[PDB]
Amino acid sequence: AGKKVLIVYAHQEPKSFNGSLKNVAVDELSRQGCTVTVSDLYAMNFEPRATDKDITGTLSNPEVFNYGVETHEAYKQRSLASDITDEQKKVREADLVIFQFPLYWFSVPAILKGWMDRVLCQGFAFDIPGFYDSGLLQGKLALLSVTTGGTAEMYTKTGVNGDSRYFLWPLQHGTLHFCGFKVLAPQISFAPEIASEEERKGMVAAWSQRLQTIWKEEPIPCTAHWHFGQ
Amino acid sequence: AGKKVLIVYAHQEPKSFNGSLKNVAVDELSRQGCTVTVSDLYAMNFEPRATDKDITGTLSNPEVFNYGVETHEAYKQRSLASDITDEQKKVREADLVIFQFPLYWFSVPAILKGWMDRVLCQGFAFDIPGFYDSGLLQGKLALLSVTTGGTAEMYTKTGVNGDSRYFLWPLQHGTLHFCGFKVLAPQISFAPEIASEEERKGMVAAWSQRLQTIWKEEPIPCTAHWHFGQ
Ligand SMILES: Cc1cc2nc3c(=O)[nH]c(=O)nc-3n(C[C@H](O)[C@H](O)[C@H](O)COP(=O)(O)OP(=O)(O)OC[C@H]3O[C@@H](n4cnc5c(N)ncnc54)[C@H](O)[C@@H]3O)c2cc1C
Ligand SMILES: Cc1cc2nc3c(=O)[nH]c(=O)nc-3n(C[C@H](O)[C@H](O)[C@H](O)COP(=O)(O)OP(=O)(O)OC[C@H]3O[C@@H](n4cnc5c(N)ncnc54)[C@H](O)[C@@H]3O)c2cc1C
Ligand SMILES: CC(=O)NCC[C@H]1C(=O)Nc2ccc(NC(C)=O)cc21
Ligand SMILES: CC(=O)NCC[C@H]1C(=O)Nc2ccc(NC(C)=O)cc21
Ligand SMILES: [Zn+2]
Ligand SMILES: [Zn+2]
């Protein structure tokens, strides 16, 4: 309290392990008195593709379509599609954005990649200047809560997949940091499908317990050193 | 020589710099007598979202939808949606797959992320076990041709963005190598928007020039060391 949290959630199945994580997050943040909002991407049939439909009215160059320029102009002229502006409003109000998603190809599922591509437009999320430490969403926290098919050992530096931190870089540094977010340590729930039962409960309660003190956390140093170095 | 190439292409605007890199690739590979096919994702309105619409028969578990399990099973039963199977046939016949795209958040645009998510399914592109060097697309080549907003200098170890290779890890290693491809060195065309008209033409010609001898190239060692040094 009086903190506001947006959960951007990307899983097709409410009964899934990702669903339980999103649900404990709602329950636990709600119990603490926080304002909570959930963008359930699949239930919304969220549009992932960046297209000239994302701008309403007529385009600032109808002959040669440049998505970055058109959306930056449209943001400034209040002319973006209402699905984008609805999400921007929720992000602008949010003190903390939590992303809840199964890892797809060492990244976010496409439907969430399209939320980042379409919602985080120039002039809203970043500008010249105002990227990295001075990006436009500075003051806000962000947190990736990711579930994997691969095991924790597969995700170490000499394991087949490399360090978990290797795949966080495009998301934590190239996206969240770039926009000005302070990045909280990722929550990574490894390999729920091949875990018991009891290990899954353990992972759910680790998350529930972490959420109890989420407002006391220090952000990570979102650096190349943090992701790759010793 | 008698080789087959698939260009998976992700830009909205035919007149764009990405469109020019795609067309020069078509022209040049066509001139050498290669068989060439282009999946122009935006023109196809390619579906990026992994949903239960991608399976047409009875689900293994209709109570709890698991997209990876159901697609794996649907692949073996030949009950995947036809847009997925159409791309799989293109990949199956290809000797080389070029991905042509602008960098979006240190990654591929969501439309192209959806293509990886949906087309490279278990059974087709890899199995457990049957990945990295045992992946199912072994013996095929892939190449990322990427355009950026940021300059070469912004993409170095000591630049704001970190080395360009850092952002290639989820795509080259986590996705292509994981499916068994050998990965040719990426073509990165930095900052065409700020480049002079002359430097822009040099970058297009450098790509066309490289493609003349693409069949003589050896792939990279797609390892943590290659991406991260250290
Ligand atoms: C296109 C695609 C690409 C992928 N790429 C990668 C990749 O790059 N790297 C990688 O490692 N993995 C990858 N995966 C695998 C994927 O990340 C995992 O399949 C996913 O993270 C599993 O999370 P889930 O929520 O779907 O698990 P679920 O299958 O829903 O959950 C596992 C089990 O937990 C149960 N459960 C639900 N709630 C609870 C509860 N509260 N307490 C205890 N148990 C509960 C479920 O019912 C289920 O039995 C990929 C998968 C796909 C489809
Ligand atoms: C959602 C989003 C996220 C992004 N994220 C990133 C990021 O993470 N990192 C990053 O660095 N950048 C990022 N960008 C910037 C993006 O990668 C660049 O805008 C894109 O790579 C530029 O390529 P283009 O084909 O669209 O260039 P264009 O604007 O189409 O090309 C530049 C100029 O070249 C001209 N041209 C076309 N053909 C030729 C030809 N044959 N010869 C000479 N000139 C020609 C065009 O007419 C144009 O004037 C992002 C952009 C968006 C919209
Ligand atoms: C042991 C086990 O089940 N491992 C999951 C493998 C996992 C991975 O490490 N990379 C990757 C890429 C795509 C998938 N896709 C699936 C599970 O459908 C899964 C993985
Ligand atoms: C000048 C420049 O574009 N710098 C590179 C940084 C890069 C990034 O990480 N995210 C992002 C988002 C948009 C852009 N540019 C545009 C046109 O949107 C560039 C970047
Ligand atoms: Zn950072
Ligand atoms: Zn590799």
Curated annotation (Swiss-Prot), chains A, B:
- Annotated residues that bind FAD are located at 11, 17-20, 103-106, 147-150, 155, 193, 200
Tell me the cofactors it needs.
Zn(2+); FAD
Tell me what controls its activity.
Answer: Inhibited by melatonin, resveratrol and 5-hydroxytryptamine.
- InterPro entries in alphabetical order: Flavodoxin_fold (IPR003680), Flavoprotein-like_sf (IPR029039), NAD(P)H_dehydrogenase_qn (IPR051545)
Entry's Pfam families?
Flavodoxin_2 (PF02525)
Which amino acid positions bind Zn(2+), per UniProt?
Answer: 173, 177, 222
The alphabetized UniProt keywords are: Cytoplasm, FAD, Flavoprotein, Metal-binding, Oxidoreductase, Phosphoprotein, Zinc
Tell me the residues on which Phosphoserine occurs: 79, 196
Might you give the EC number(s) for this enzyme?
1.10.5.1
Per its record, the protein catalyses: 1-(beta-D-ribofuranosyl)-1,4-dihydronicotinamide + a quinone + H(+) = beta-nicotinamide D-riboside + a quinol
An example GO BP is: quinone catabolic process
Q: What does this protein's record comment on cofactor binding? A: Binds 1 zinc ion per subunit.
Q: What is the effect of changing residue 161 to H?
A: Loss of activity toward CB1954, no effect toward menadione
State where it is primarily located: cytoplasm
Cellular component GO terms held in the UniProt record:
cytosol; extracellular exosome; nucleoplasm
Compartments, as annotated in UniProt? Cytoplasm
MF-aspect GO terms = chloride ion binding; dihydronicotinamide riboside quinone reductase activity; electron transfer activity; FAD binding; melatonin binding; NAD(P)H dehydrogenase (quinone) activity; oxidoreductase activity; oxidoreductase activity, acting on other nitrogenous compounds as donors
Q: Where does substrate bind?
A: 126-128
| Coiled coil, from the record | none
User: Which EC class does it fall in?
Assistant: oxidoreductase
Give the family, as the similarity comment puts it: Belongs to the NAD(P)H dehydrogenase (quinone) family.
Q: What else is known?
A: Uses dihydronicotinamide riboside (NRH) rather than NAD(P)H as an electron donor.
Q: What does this protein do?
A: The enzyme apparently serves as a quinone reductase in connection with conjugation reactions of hydroquinones involved in detoxification pathways as well as in biosynthetic processes such as the vitamin K-dependent gamma-carboxylation of glutamate residues in prothrombin synthesis.
Question: What is known about its subunit structure?
Answer: Homodimer.
In its UniProt entry, what is this protein called?
Ribosyldihydronicotinamide dehydrogenase [quinone]
Q: What organism does this protein naturally occur in?
A: Homo sapiens (Human)
